[PDB]
Design a protein around this ligand. Structure first.
Ligand SMILES: Nc1ncnc2c1ncn2[C@H]1C[C@H](O)[C@@H](COP(=O)(O)O)O1
Ligand SMILES: Nc1ncnc2c1ncn2[C@H]1C[C@H](O)[C@@H](COP(=O)(O)O)O1
Ligand SMILES: Nc1ncnc2c1ncn2[C@H]1C[C@H](O)[C@@H](COP(=O)(O)O)O1
Ligand SMILES: [Mg+2]
Ligand SMILES: [Mg+2]
Ligand SMILES: [Mg+2]
Lengths: 195, 195, 195
């Protein structure tokens, strides 16, 4: 929805945390995006894999509630409690202290999740960031793909909060936000004085 | 046609043999595709270069028959005689012991074929694989591009069967099929027992 | 317009000069294009960044005339005075001895121009090539992006003719044209004799 797009404008967010932290181009690329979003006052604008995976998300959500019996509340963008212009959009608030994060990737990506039993470190970061913004205690990581035989369609794993990884993330994100605002500050002053 | 798409589902085929054999990512990428095709029960789904080259194929076919006078029979997917789930789709059965393989690539690719007089090793593999599935003795390799001056439009070269390259191919393909089926076997057993 | 497309067919042009000169694949890639254009008798055929940047070009043109008060004449393809099949399409003839060259890139590219105050060396080459075909004395390099705050939207810098860089360019371009024509010559003779 357009509400939340506007809440997201220019903030670092859970799913881009791996880019912020990457040992790279995807960091400065991400920075540039956010600088532009802030300066221009909007975002830019998705393959049929993404589109299809979006449709399937509610199928996953339901399968999870079937599986567990949890009460899951859909939510908006949750701003970090302390770090301003930083936030998260979890797929839902599970019970009183949990979260859900749902993937509907390509069949092959799904299979590799079944194969290894573990979410990619970039998703670990994404979830840890969610827990950090929501002060929640665990996140359930669902992967779902209905094109598969029945016992391969659904996968779930819990990832417990981790205040250590969270501590790092908060630093890096704060540092990166410092850079990003000074970079904006800087251009303004050149452009300004120059005018 | 959809008939042949279904005959192709999940099999290694002549034109992907270079990927199987590559000294690489394109091998495991190909493997993943075939695993998915088998497990999901279908394929995924082409630029205007491909689309255009498909239209031009019958122009090439005719030019070849004009040039040679051969009787060429269009055929479906031809399964390897011994290696199961392996096959080939030659562009036609030329006479009693020949095949045709037709390219309508970009103008520049065509010119480089005129320039060197030889088909790319990946096409050598593709044709050798055709001869292997059809027990045919040679394949005529046509390249065609009508955007060119007249004497550059059409190129043809014969490639004789080669039971040595064919021997290798059959090994690699068999090995790769072994992997691919065990990989499927494996996931089933994890998923199964896990359910 | 289609007039100028036909004037451009098969010639090296100002904006592709960096490719000709590159220390690479983009050189032979460019060569192949031009060979194909000459042999086939036409060009091949752009994202929404390009499309959008094209729309904005007249906004830039006007802003420049607002800023300076110059009389700017839009022009076609200007053929090099001596080197045949070589030419330039400047964005306009400024006054009696100037040129304009207008960019409407992505916001981030624009910002990096504000940041460094200097046009990318590939644009230096492009402008020098314009001066070389027009015998003009300077080129004004405009970058424009209206999505930005007001004092960041518009940037301008002058680049004086430079007969030294121009001398180099003319060599490289002549050399590259020699190659390109002999390459065409060559294929003809193979194809010809072969027929
Ligand atoms: N533009 C757009 N439309 C729809 N879905 C999107 C879009 N961008 C990202 N996403 C998805 C991908 C992430 O899982 C989540 C953003 O979460 P966060 O924690 O806020 O990074 O939403
Ligand atoms: N999806 C699809 N549609 C149309 N044509 C295709 C498609 N995939 C491959 N091809 C072409 C490319 C190969 O020359 C041949 C497959 O031959 P084989 O020996 O079976 O690999 O058909
Ligand atoms: N196909 C097409 N349509 C519209 N605009 C184009 C096209 N190709 C290049 N350009 C733009 C990019 C260059 O600034 C200029 C060509 O200038 P020159 O000095 O001639 O290289 O025009
Ligand atoms: Mg999700
Ligand atoms: Mg073919
Ligand atoms: Mg321009």
């Amino acid at each position: 929805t357009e509400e939340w797009f506007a809440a997201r404008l220019g903030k670092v967010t859970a799913s881009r945390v791996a880019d912020v932290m990457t040992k790279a181009a995807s960091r400065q690329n991400y920075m540039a995006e956010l600088i532009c979003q802030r300066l221009t006052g909007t975002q830019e604008i998705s393959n049929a894999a993404m589109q299809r995976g979006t449709e399937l998300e509610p199928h996953a959500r339901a399968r999870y509630i079937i599986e567990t019996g949890e009460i899951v509340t859909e939510v908006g963008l949750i701003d970090h409690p302390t770090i301003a212009g930083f936030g998260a959009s979890p797929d839902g608030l599970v019970g009183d202290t949990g979260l859900i994060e749902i993937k509907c990737p390509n069949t092959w990506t799904h299979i590799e999740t079944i194969k290894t039993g573990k979410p990619k470190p970039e998703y670990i970061k994404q979830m840890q960031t969610q827990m950090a913004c929501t002060g929640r205690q665990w996140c359930d990581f669902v992967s779902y793909d209905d094109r598969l035989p029945d016992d391969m369609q659904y996968f779930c794993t819990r990832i417990e909060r981790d205040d250590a990884l969270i501590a790092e993330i908060e630093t890096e994100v704060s540092a990166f936000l410092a850079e990003l605002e000074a970079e904006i500050e800087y251009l303004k002053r050149k452009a300004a004085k120059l005018a």
